[PDB]
Amino acid sequence: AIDEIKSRGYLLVGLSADFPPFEFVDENGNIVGFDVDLAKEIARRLGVELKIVDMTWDGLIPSLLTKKIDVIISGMTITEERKKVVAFSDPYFDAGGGGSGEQYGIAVRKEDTDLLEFINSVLRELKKL
Ligand SMILES: NC(=[NH2+])NCCC[C@H](N)C(=O)O
């Protein structure tokens, strides 16, 4: 998965831009927010451009499974149910503090274990700061 993204020259991140402050569309029509910033960080570290694909919430896992996006970064709670279908990064946002509550993760296809590893190393470096 990594070599393919690097050859393509961009990282395709799906989200649903209706969830400020994680992703939303600002007053100039730009998609912005915490998840966009994180997506940019990951893309930079991969040495690729970022392409954000905005879609309806329900569209995201399908698009991931069918390879139209590489990852979901869209305020998605890590849950045991969803782990039946996708893999999740380490948590990057804790809604409750102390790891209580919803923890958000980056969803990746289960077979893309190299991508998942890579993302985890970026989250681990960012948390070190
Ligand atoms: N971009 C969005 N609409 N995100 C909604 C996230 C809601 C909730 N954290 C979930 O994972 O279902």
Author numbering: 1 to 129
Give verbatim excerpts from the published study on this entry.
In the last few years, we have characterized the arginine-binding protein isolated from the hyperthermophilic organism Thermotoga maritima (TmArgBP). The biophysical characterization of the protein has also revealed that it is endowed with an unusual stability against temperature, chemical denaturants and pressure.
Although both domains cooperate to the anchoring of the arginine in the wild-type protein, only D1 is able to bind this ligand when considered as isolated entity. Due to the different numbering scheme adopted for TmArgBP D1 (see the notations section in the Materials and Methods), the mutation is F57W and the mutant is denoted thereafter D1F57W. The asymmetric unit of the crystals contains two copies of the domain whose structure is very similar both at local and at global level (the RMSD value of the two copies is 0.31 Å). A comparative analysis of the global structure of D1F57W with previous structural characterizations of D1 in different binding states or embodied in the native protein indicates that the mutation does not produce major rearrangements. The inspection of the binding pocket indicates that the arginine is anchored by a remarkable number of residues that establish a variety of different interactions with the ligand. A remarkable contribution to the recognition of arg is provided by the mutated residue W57. The values of the side chain dihedral angles (χ1; χ2) that the residue adopts in the crystallographic structure are (−178.16°, −92.18°) and (174.49°, −108.34°) for the two molecules present in the asymmetric unit. This observation indicates that W57 assumes the rotameric state predicted by the computational analysis reported above. Notably, the accessible surface area of this residue decreases from 104.9 Å2, in the absence of the ligand, to 31.6 Å2. The drastic change in the local environment of the tryptophan explains the variation of the fluorescence signal associated with the arginine binding.
